[PDB]
Design a protein around this motif. Structure first.
Motif, short mmCIF file in Angstrom:
data_model
loop_
_atom_site.label_atom_id
_atom_site.label_comp_id
_atom_site.label_asym_id
_atom_site.label_seq_id
_atom_site.Cartn_x
_atom_site.Cartn_y
_atom_site.Cartn_z
N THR A 123 -5.49 10.99 -37.93
CA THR A 123 -5.16 11.04 -36.52
C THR A 123 -5.08 9.67 -35.87
O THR A 123 -4.15 9.37 -35.13
CB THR A 123 -6.20 11.86 -35.75
N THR A 124 -6.06 8.82 -36.17
CA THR A 124 -6.13 7.48 -35.61
C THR A 124 -5.00 6.53 -35.99
O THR A 124 -4.38 5.94 -35.11
CB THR A 124 -7.48 6.82 -35.94
N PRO A 125 -4.71 6.36 -37.29
CA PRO A 125 -3.62 5.43 -37.56
C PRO A 125 -2.37 5.88 -36.83
O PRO A 125 -1.59 5.06 -36.33
CB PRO A 125 -3.46 5.49 -39.08
N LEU A 126 -2.17 7.19 -36.76
CA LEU A 126 -1.00 7.70 -36.07
C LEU A 126 -1.02 7.26 -34.61
O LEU A 126 -0.08 6.64 -34.13
CB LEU A 126 -0.96 9.23 -36.17
N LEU A 127 -2.11 7.57 -33.91
CA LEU A 127 -2.26 7.20 -32.50
C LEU A 127 -1.89 5.75 -32.24
O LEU A 127 -0.98 5.46 -31.47
CB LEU A 127 -3.70 7.44 -32.04
N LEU A 128 -2.61 4.84 -32.90
CA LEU A 128 -2.37 3.41 -32.74
C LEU A 128 -0.89 3.12 -32.90
O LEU A 128 -0.35 2.23 -32.26
CB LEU A 128 -3.17 2.62 -33.77
N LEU A 129 -0.25 3.88 -33.78
CA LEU A 129 1.17 3.72 -34.03
C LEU A 129 1.97 4.11 -32.80
O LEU A 129 2.95 3.46 -32.43
CB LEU A 129 1.60 4.58 -35.22
N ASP A 130 1.54 5.20 -32.15
CA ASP A 130 2.21 5.69 -30.96
C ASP A 130 2.24 4.60 -29.90
O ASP A 130 3.27 4.34 -29.29
CB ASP A 130 1.47 6.90 -30.41
N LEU A 131 1.09 3.98 -29.69
CA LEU A 131 0.98 2.91 -28.71
C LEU A 131 1.92 1.78 -29.09
O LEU A 131 2.80 1.41 -28.32
CB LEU A 131 -0.46 2.39 -28.66
N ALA A 132 1.73 1.26 -30.29
CA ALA A 132 2.54 0.16 -30.80
C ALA A 132 4.02 0.33 -30.47
O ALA A 132 4.62 -0.52 -29.81
CB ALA A 132 2.35 0.02 -32.30
N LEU A 133 4.60 1.43 -30.92
CA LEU A 133 6.01 1.70 -30.67
C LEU A 133 6.32 1.73 -29.18
O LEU A 133 7.25 1.07 -28.71
CB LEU A 133 6.43 3.02 -31.32
N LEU A 134 5.54 2.51 -28.45
CA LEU A 134 5.72 2.64 -27.01
C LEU A 134 5.97 1.26 -26.42
O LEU A 134 7.00 1.01 -25.79
CB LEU A 134 4.47 3.25 -26.38
N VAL A 135 5.02 0.36 -26.65
CA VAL A 135 5.11 -1.02 -26.17
C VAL A 135 6.20 -1.78 -26.91
O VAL A 135 6.84 -2.67 -26.34
CB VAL A 135 3.75 -1.75 -26.33
N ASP A 136 6.40 -1.44 -28.18
CA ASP A 136 7.40 -2.08 -29.03
C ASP A 136 6.88 -3.41 -29.59
O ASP A 136 7.23 -4.48 -29.08
CB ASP A 136 8.70 -2.31 -28.26
N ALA A 137 6.07 -3.32 -30.64
CA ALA A 137 5.49 -4.51 -31.28
C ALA A 137 6.35 -4.99 -32.45
O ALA A 137 7.56 -5.13 -32.33
CB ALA A 137 4.08 -4.20 -31.76
N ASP A 138 5.70 -5.25 -33.59
CA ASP A 138 6.39 -5.71 -34.78
C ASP A 138 5.62 -5.33 -36.05
O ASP A 138 4.40 -5.51 -36.12
CB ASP A 138 6.59 -7.23 -34.73
N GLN A 139 6.34 -4.81 -37.04
CA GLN A 139 5.76 -4.37 -38.31
C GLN A 139 4.44 -5.05 -38.64
O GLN A 139 3.40 -4.40 -38.75
CB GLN A 139 6.74 -4.61 -39.46
N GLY A 140 4.48 -6.37 -38.79
CA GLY A 140 3.28 -7.12 -39.12
C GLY A 140 2.08 -6.78 -38.25
O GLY A 140 1.04 -6.36 -38.76
N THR A 141 2.23 -6.96 -36.94
CA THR A 141 1.14 -6.67 -36.01
C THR A 141 0.59 -5.27 -36.25
O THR A 141 -0.61 -5.10 -36.50
CB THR A 141 1.62 -6.79 -34.56
N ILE A 142 1.47 -4.28 -36.17
CA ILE A 142 1.07 -2.89 -36.37
C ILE A 142 0.41 -2.72 -37.73
O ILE A 142 -0.59 -2.03 -37.86
CB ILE A 142 2.28 -1.93 -36.28
N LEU A 143 0.99 -3.36 -38.75
CA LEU A 143 0.48 -3.28 -40.11
C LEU A 143 -1.00 -3.63 -40.18
O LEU A 143 -1.82 -2.84 -40.66
CB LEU A 143 1.29 -4.23 -41.01
#
Ligand code: RET
Ligand code: RET
Ligand code: RET
Lengths: 230, 230, 230
Positions: free
Chosen positions: C88-108
């Protein structure tokens, strides 16, 4: 060694020789290709039987079998399959998705969908107290119905491609997918240790045919198909 | 507490201090960078030792050790390593791939390849009945040979870059990769509880050197290298 | 059946009805959308409660509970949560990341970061010998602090979007994220079987509220928000 006693052996060993030989052939077909689009597909398939092979081995001699007791006895289930189907399946669904050419999101939901499908299934198997077992069984199959839905309804509707070939080839894959899979749930309920109506010998037989036909067959028509050109 | 008795401790604890301190330094080097290409690389590396650290800790005091009995006795194996190497490795191979700049498909097959490599390895470890153990051992090492092959033959052939630096730096990484790794298989067979020829003390010693040198070393020349500019 | 005795039941069952109903509603909201950007977000969320539901079920009747003995007794911990929070958590953090629009590395890096956060946490739980338990506890929470840091400091600094809406909506999400999560660590230390100060009844109560509010709430304001337009 004890790769005898338990009758199922002949069946397991069978699924094995088939899996290994398969991954080997596809292995070749892929060799050197300006195919990267296809090359992608290839790598995927090859991996699929590969896993099925290793798993089937463990399942055969040592690993794969426990003794989940429910209803009022000691049942011999082969959890190993739960693992192999687990990885193999998300990959497969991925093969289809790309072939047709969907979109991250769609595929994403489909992936998690399967994950829960099999995962939950397993949980049921080990669950003990056969009543609750069937309960989890219901949850899982439901998920399955969802994936199938997106497959024909969703993919077919997209399955539109400029290439009639790509369009047809897909159709076939989605279809075989539907039938074989449906079998999986049914068989496990009446068969295996749950309902205890179908003996383990025949249970292992049917399950086996399902594996080889699904992974090897699907992968075959697919690669051989002009879809993964080159 | 019992972080004594078992002699190996000194060795484990060693691998530990090294891992943690490492992840810490790389941690710094990465800090703020218009490097996103590199930043990507950084994140990857940093994570690698990080994991190795946590694992090594468990392995040290509580977690990581079982009692797989085979041949005719109770053997003490440290499964923990199986986990740490598991995640750490797919990441590493990924670092190389990107550095050189391959293609989803190629990297994909490589990933699943490693997964099966280590995974199967583990299965063998716990397997019991030492004979079958070695069997699974054969399967795994085979997979390893495949990955190596794609590394030099495949990557080197691609390793062509417009930048001589990028081309060379890679070469070095692929090489060290080859040697260290090969050691892993050999050591486990003669050493550890399988062949039971190399004592656990020395076994833990060698394995350790392998970890620190591979993860920390590889990651070091890599980041420090102009490959991940900035 | 024994979905009684253990008082916590009422609480568990509660978290359950809430989770399932939630995934169901979002399920609808997503239905057919030229939203693929958003559709992506949708799929993610929907999946999140879905998992939480299945898990909560197991946790309720059969699966999820063991008997990790430490300090000097037999403690009843619900490992199940460790699994559910994990995916559930990795997914969530992913939701935020995309929303804001980060970058593979950071999210990784963020992904691996969480993985170690929860994972290690679990290891502690089962660890036995309560002293060492708290040790692992320290490691995990540390990781948590890192993710939070990148969230506000890093994301907010990026959170700049041309759209004031997107910018604000995010801010809210990152904030609620911070508070609720912080609660998780604290509660587990004083509560549950570790410090043994907060009874299991209330412990299950608090944890529960945390889940529903975090997954369902977060996902709600998010989807309903103009961020995932359509
Ligand atoms: C050889 C691998 C394949 C393609 C896997 C097939 C299995 C399924 C996805 C079926 C899953 C099940 C249910 C729908 C519910 C009951 C338990 C399972 C795992 C048999
Ligand atoms: C520190 C982590 C690293 C880079 C991992 C190294 C280990 C290998 C990939 C080796 C795998 C093995 C075999 C080839 C077969 C026997 C069992 C293993 C796991 C030692
Ligand atoms: C419902 C799922 C959510 C969003 C998960 C929340 C849990 C955390 C990420 C907290 C992790 C923990 C620590 C920081 C250390 C102690 C153990 C945990 C797992 C409670």
């Amino acid at each position: 060694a004890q790769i005898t006693g338990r009758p199922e052996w002949i069946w397991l060993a069978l699924g094995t020789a088939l899996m290994g030989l398969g991954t080997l052939y596809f292995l070749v077909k892929g060799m050197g290709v300006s195919d990267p689009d296809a090359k992608k597909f290839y790598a995927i398939t090859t991996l699929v039987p590969a896993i099925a092979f290793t798993m089937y081995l463990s399942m055969l001699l040592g690993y794969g079998l426990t003794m989940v007791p429910f209803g009022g006895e000691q049942n011999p289930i082969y959890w190993a399959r739960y693992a192999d189907w687990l990885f193999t399946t998300p990959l497969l669904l991925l093969d289809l998705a790309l072939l047709v050419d969907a979109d991250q999101g769609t595929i994403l939901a489909l992936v998690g969908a399967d994950g829960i499908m099999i995962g939950t299934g397993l949980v049921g198997a080990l669950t003990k107290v056969y009543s609750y077992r069937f309960v989890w069984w219901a949850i899982s199959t439901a998920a399955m119905l969802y994936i199938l839905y997106v497959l024909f309804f969703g993919f077919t509707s997209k399955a539109e491609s400029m290439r009639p070939e790509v369009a047809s080839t897909f159709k076939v894959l989605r279809n075989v997918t539907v039938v074989l899979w449906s079998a999986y749930p049914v068989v496990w309920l009446i068969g295996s240790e749950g309902a205890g109506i179908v003996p383990l010998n025949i249970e292992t037989l049917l399950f086996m045919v399902l594996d080889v036909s699904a992974k090897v067959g699907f992968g075959l028509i697919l690669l051989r198909s002009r879809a993964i050109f080159g």
